[PDB]
Design a protein around this motif. Structure first.
Motif, PDB file in Angstrom:
ATOM      1  N   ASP A 188     -80.707 -33.004  55.195  1.00 35.85           N
ATOM      2  CA  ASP A 188     -79.394 -32.677  54.645  1.00 35.85           C
ATOM      3  C   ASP A 188     -78.812 -33.820  53.816  1.00 35.85           C
ATOM      4  O   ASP A 188     -78.215 -33.585  52.766  1.00 35.85           O
ATOM      5  CB  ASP A 188     -78.421 -32.292  55.764  1.00 35.85           C
ATOM      6  CG  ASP A 188     -78.242 -33.393  56.788  1.00 35.85           C
ATOM      7  OD1 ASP A 188     -79.247 -34.043  57.141  1.00 35.85           O
ATOM      8  OD2 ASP A 188     -77.097 -33.609  57.236  1.00 35.85           O
ATOM      9  N   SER A 238     -86.814 -17.851  56.731  1.00 33.13           N
ATOM     10  CA  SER A 238     -85.560 -17.885  55.988  1.00 33.13           C
ATOM     11  C   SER A 238     -85.702 -18.664  54.686  1.00 33.13           C
ATOM     12  O   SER A 238     -86.513 -19.584  54.586  1.00 33.13           O
ATOM     13  CB  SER A 238     -84.448 -18.497  56.843  1.00 33.13           C
ATOM     14  OG  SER A 238     -83.256 -18.651  56.092  1.00 33.13           O
ATOM     15  N   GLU A 239     -84.908 -18.289  53.690  1.00 29.22           N
ATOM     16  CA  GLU A 239     -84.903 -18.984  52.410  1.00 29.22           C
ATOM     17  C   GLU A 239     -84.072 -20.260  52.496  1.00 29.22           C
ATOM     18  O   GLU A 239     -84.495 -21.322  52.038  1.00 29.22           O
ATOM     19  CB  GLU A 239     -84.365 -18.072  51.304  1.00 29.22           C
ATOM     20  CG  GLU A 239     -84.194 -18.761  49.959  1.00 29.22           C
ATOM     21  CD  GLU A 239     -85.503 -19.279  49.395  1.00 29.22           C
ATOM     22  OE1 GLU A 239     -85.493 -20.351  48.754  1.00 29.22           O
ATOM     23  OE2 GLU A 239     -86.542 -18.612  49.589  1.00 29.22           O
ATOM     24  N   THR A 240     -82.890 -20.145  53.094  1.00 32.41           N
ATOM     25  CA  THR A 240     -81.977 -21.274  53.229  1.00 32.41           C
ATOM     26  C   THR A 240     -82.512 -22.303  54.221  1.00 32.41           C
ATOM     27  O   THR A 240     -82.214 -23.493  54.122  1.00 32.41           O
ATOM     28  CB  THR A 240     -80.579 -20.809  53.690  1.00 32.41           C
ATOM     29  OG1 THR A 240     -80.185 -19.652  52.943  1.00 32.41           O
ATOM     30  CG2 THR A 240     -79.547 -21.913  53.494  1.00 32.41           C
ATOM     31  N   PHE A 284     -81.924 -21.547  57.317  1.00 34.91           N
ATOM     32  CA  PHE A 284     -80.923 -21.278  58.339  1.00 34.91           C
ATOM     33  C   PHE A 284     -80.993 -19.829  58.802  1.00 34.91           C
ATOM     34  O   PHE A 284     -81.278 -18.927  58.014  1.00 34.91           O
ATOM     35  CB  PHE A 284     -79.519 -21.589  57.815  1.00 34.91           C
ATOM     36  CG  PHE A 284     -79.215 -23.057  57.719  1.00 34.91           C
ATOM     37  CD1 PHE A 284     -79.732 -23.822  56.687  1.00 34.91           C
ATOM     38  CD2 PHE A 284     -78.399 -23.667  58.657  1.00 34.91           C
ATOM     39  CE1 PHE A 284     -79.449 -25.172  56.597  1.00 34.91           C
ATOM     40  CE2 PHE A 284     -78.110 -25.017  58.573  1.00 34.91           C
ATOM     41  CZ  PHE A 284     -78.637 -25.770  57.541  1.00 34.91           C
ATOM     42  N   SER A 321     -78.698 -16.959  61.069  1.00 40.26           N
ATOM     43  CA  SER A 321     -77.423 -16.642  61.700  1.00 40.26           C
ATOM     44  C   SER A 321     -77.592 -16.373  63.190  1.00 40.26           C
ATOM     45  O   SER A 321     -78.679 -16.020  63.646  1.00 40.26           O
ATOM     46  CB  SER A 321     -76.777 -15.433  61.021  1.00 40.26           C
ATOM     47  OG  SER A 321     -77.570 -14.271  61.186  1.00 40.26           O
ATOM     48  N   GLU A 329     -74.730 -20.648  61.718  1.00 44.17           N
ATOM     49  CA  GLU A 329     -76.159 -20.493  61.470  1.00 44.17           C
ATOM     50  C   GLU A 329     -76.927 -21.712  61.973  1.00 44.17           C
ATOM     51  O   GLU A 329     -76.396 -22.822  61.990  1.00 44.17           O
ATOM     52  CB  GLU A 329     -76.424 -20.268  59.980  1.00 44.17           C
ATOM     53  CG  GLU A 329     -75.802 -18.993  59.431  1.00 44.17           C
ATOM     54  CD  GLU A 329     -76.230 -18.699  58.007  1.00 44.17           C
ATOM     55  OE1 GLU A 329     -76.491 -19.660  57.251  1.00 44.17           O
ATOM     56  OE2 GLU A 329     -76.311 -17.506  57.645  1.00 44.17           O
ATOM     57  N   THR A 336     -80.398 -24.310  62.126  1.00 45.02           N
ATOM     58  CA  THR A 336     -81.582 -24.868  61.485  1.00 45.02           C
ATOM     59  C   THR A 336     -82.243 -25.863  62.433  1.00 45.02           C
ATOM     60  O   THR A 336     -81.644 -26.268  63.428  1.00 45.02           O
ATOM     61  CB  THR A 336     -81.244 -25.570  60.156  1.00 45.02           C
ATOM     62  OG1 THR A 336     -82.451 -25.842  59.431  1.00 45.02           O
ATOM     63  CG2 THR A 336     -80.510 -26.875  60.419  1.00 45.02           C
ATOM     64  N   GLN A 394     -85.192 -26.690  54.987  1.00 43.61           N
ATOM     65  CA  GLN A 394     -84.181 -26.434  53.972  1.00 43.61           C
ATOM     66  C   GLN A 394     -84.429 -27.320  52.757  1.00 43.61           C
ATOM     67  O   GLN A 394     -85.013 -28.397  52.875  1.00 43.61           O
ATOM     68  CB  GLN A 394     -82.778 -26.679  54.531  1.00 43.61           C
ATOM     69  CG  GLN A 394     -82.527 -28.110  54.975  1.00 43.61           C
ATOM     70  CD  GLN A 394     -81.192 -28.278  55.675  1.00 43.61           C
ATOM     71  OE1 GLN A 394     -80.145 -28.361  55.032  1.00 43.61           O
ATOM     72  NE2 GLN A 394     -81.222 -28.323  57.002  1.00 43.61           N
ATOM     73  N   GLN A 434     -84.099 -27.451  47.968  1.00 51.21           N
ATOM     74  CA  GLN A 434     -83.845 -26.811  46.685  1.00 51.21           C
ATOM     75  C   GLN A 434     -85.143 -26.314  46.065  1.00 51.21           C
ATOM     76  O   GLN A 434     -86.187 -26.955  46.189  1.00 51.21           O
ATOM     77  CB  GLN A 434     -83.140 -27.776  45.731  1.00 51.21           C
ATOM     78  CG  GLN A 434     -81.775 -28.231  46.210  1.00 51.21           C
ATOM     79  CD  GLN A 434     -81.121 -29.207  45.256  1.00 51.21           C
ATOM     80  OE1 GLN A 434     -81.745 -29.675  44.304  1.00 51.21           O
ATOM     81  NE2 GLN A 434     -79.854 -29.516  45.502  1.00 51.21           N
ATOM     82  N   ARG A 471     -90.628 -26.243  45.986  1.00 51.24           N
ATOM     83  CA  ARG A 471     -89.435 -26.631  46.728  1.00 51.24           C
ATOM     84  C   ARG A 471     -89.418 -28.129  47.009  1.00 51.24           C
ATOM     85  O   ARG A 471     -90.469 -28.768  47.078  1.00 51.24           O
ATOM     86  CB  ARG A 471     -89.344 -25.849  48.041  1.00 51.24           C
ATOM     87  CG  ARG A 471     -89.100 -24.356  47.873  1.00 51.24           C
ATOM     88  CD  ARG A 471     -88.927 -23.678  49.226  1.00 51.24           C
ATOM     89  NE  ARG A 471     -88.448 -22.304  49.107  1.00 51.24           N
ATOM     90  CZ  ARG A 471     -89.240 -21.236  49.048  1.00 51.24           C
ATOM     91  NH1 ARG A 471     -90.557 -21.382  49.097  1.00 51.24           N
ATOM     92  NH2 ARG A 471     -88.716 -20.023  48.940  1.00 51.24           N
ATOM     93  N   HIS A 495     -80.230 -27.101  40.101  1.00 48.47           N
ATOM     94  CA  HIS A 495     -79.359 -27.432  41.224  1.00 48.47           C
ATOM     95  C   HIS A 495     -78.734 -28.820  41.127  1.00 48.47           C
ATOM     96  O   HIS A 495     -79.088 -29.619  40.259  1.00 48.47           O
ATOM     97  CB  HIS A 495     -80.136 -27.307  42.534  1.00 48.47           C
ATOM     98  CG  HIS A 495     -80.880 -26.017  42.671  1.00 48.47           C
ATOM     99  ND1 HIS A 495     -80.247 -24.806  42.846  1.00 48.47           N
ATOM    100  CD2 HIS A 495     -82.210 -25.748  42.658  1.00 48.47           C
ATOM    101  CE1 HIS A 495     -81.151 -23.845  42.935  1.00 48.47           C
ATOM    102  NE2 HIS A 495     -82.349 -24.394  42.824  1.00 48.47           N
TER     103      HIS A 495
END
Ligand SMILES: [Zn+2]
Ligand SMILES: [Zn+2]
Lengths: 197, 236
Positions: B68, B109-111, B113, B115, B155, B157, B190, B192, B200, B227
């Motif tokens: 992060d 998941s794409e993010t 994360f 839920s 959410e 991760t 996670q 970009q 990625r 991004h």
């Protein structure tokens, strides 16, 4: 079959990990659980693996693997290091009040450096009136009524304590880290760095 | 290897805590030294010394960077590949399968994360003792408490410690679903992604790769990077 040195070393590594991850909840460990969940088919050389695990658990992590009861086949890790730091309650403790003080000092920091007397009183007994009266005389608190009794930290606390240490206290009160409460934490950094110059 | 009591107490507290930021282990290193008062060696020399003692156990104090903001973290990590046992020993069978289900959702998941509502729908699927959503909501917070999961906006991760612990396990188990960074070639939860191609990057990796560059271009297709470029982590 043909088990190499690495296989045996990986085996005693599973055993020392097994004892460590378990003991942390004061289990205590059973031989049947050991033979089932890590040893497996290496049971033919179990007493050697167990001994090597014990010395590695001792030399590296500083724990003594002890059968808590003779002829019980159940074991416990005993900390063979320096007593202090989960330590001294089983012996040496500060004045109960200092504990009481810490909550009040903490509770003030929690609400936002301010709290009204009646609220904390509903918290406290669960000499609440007398102790919180001379705490101000000791300058551990402030007893102002200026627009009730409004509470603040007073002069003495800053010299014997910081908001970060209080934050370390409130974190350890029931598990957490300061970081959990960045609302409280962020100003502690503005204080911790301020303690420099 | 040369192993004193300050090294043992360091290892003891490094296991009570799940993972520590670099400044907190340096704080921890000095802490253990002040409860035994010689020269405090460099943190690198202190760690490298211990790892050479841990070699026979095939575990190590491994440095890692968060996904992060890219702050350095340290955790006691198995050199092996079946490192699922570190949580398998600490939790129950149903709590275990709950983490696996949660893990499956985070990877796909794409993010990076997943839920809470999506995870809590797999409660009836859980192996072992029957649990319910109320209990499962507590277990997820326990995962957060033991630094296996990170929660943001309801959410979840993977925590940096989790990646350190069982990156080997994750890759060998979900080779088709995993994502790798184009820069460091490591496991990615996670990050970009380019919109021209599909590569990625870890947020800290795009931060250093596009550092001071006035026109960030995707290293694979040389197209303009869509991004935001973060600033590399600096301890100040
Ligand atoms: Zn990367
Ligand atoms: Zn591209």
């Amino acid at each position: 079959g043909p088990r190499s040195q690495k296989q045996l070393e990986l085996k005693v590594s599973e055993l020392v990990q097994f004892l460590l991850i378990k003991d942390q909840k004061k289990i205590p460990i059973k031989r049947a659980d050991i033979l089932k969940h890590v040893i497996g088919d290496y049971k033919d050389i179990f007493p050697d693996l167990f001994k090597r695990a014990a010395e590695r658990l001792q030399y590296v992590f500083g724990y003594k693997l002890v059968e808590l009861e003779p002829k019980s086949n159940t074991y416990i890790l005993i900390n063979t290091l320096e007593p202090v730091e989960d330590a001294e309650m089983r012996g040496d403790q500060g004045t109960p009040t200092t504990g009481l003080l810490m909550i009040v000092l903490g509770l003030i920091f929690m609400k936002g450096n301010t709290l009204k007397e009646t609220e904390a009183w509903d918290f406290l007994r669960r000499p609440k009136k007398l102790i919180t009266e001379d705490f101000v005389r000791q300058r551990y608190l402030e007893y102002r009524r200026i627009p009730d009794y409004e509470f603040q930290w007073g002069p003495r606390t800053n010299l014997e304590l910081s908001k970060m240490k209080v934050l370390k206290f409130v974190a350890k009160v029931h598990n957490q880290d300061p970081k959990d409460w960045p609302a409280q934490y962020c100003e502690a950094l503005a204080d911790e760095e301020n303690r420099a110059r | 290897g040369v192993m004193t009591d300050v090294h043992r107490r360091f290892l003891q507290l490094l296991m009570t805590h799940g993972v520590l930021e670099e400044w907190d282990v340096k704080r921890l290193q000095t802490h253990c030294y002040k409860v035994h008062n010689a020269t405090v060696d460099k943190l690198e020399d202190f760690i490298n010394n211990i790892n050479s003692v841990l070699e026979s156990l095939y575990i190590e104090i491994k440095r890692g960077v968060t996904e992060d903001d890219g702050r350095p973290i340290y955790a006691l990590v198995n050199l092996a590949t079946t490192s699922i046992s570190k949580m398998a020993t600490d939790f129950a069978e149903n709590e275990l399968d709950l983490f696996r289900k949660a893990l499956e959702l985070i990877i796909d998941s794409e993010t990076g994360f997943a839920s809470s509502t999506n995870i809590l729908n797999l409660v009836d699927q859980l192996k072992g003792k029957k649990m319910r959503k109320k209990e499962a909501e507590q277990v997820l917070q326990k995962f957060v408490q033991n630094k296996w999961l990170i929660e943001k906006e309801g959410e979840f991760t993977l925590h940096g410690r989790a990646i350190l612990e069982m990156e080997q396990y994750i890759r060998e188990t979900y080779p088709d679903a995993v994502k790798i960074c184009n820069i460091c070639h490591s496991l990615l939860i996670q990050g970009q992604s380019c919109e021209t191609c599909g590569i990625r990057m870890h947020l800290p990796c795009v931060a250093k790769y596009f550092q001071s560059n006035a026109e960030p271009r995707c290293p694979h297709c040389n197209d303009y990077w869509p991004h935001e470029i973060p600033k590399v982590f600096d301890p100040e």
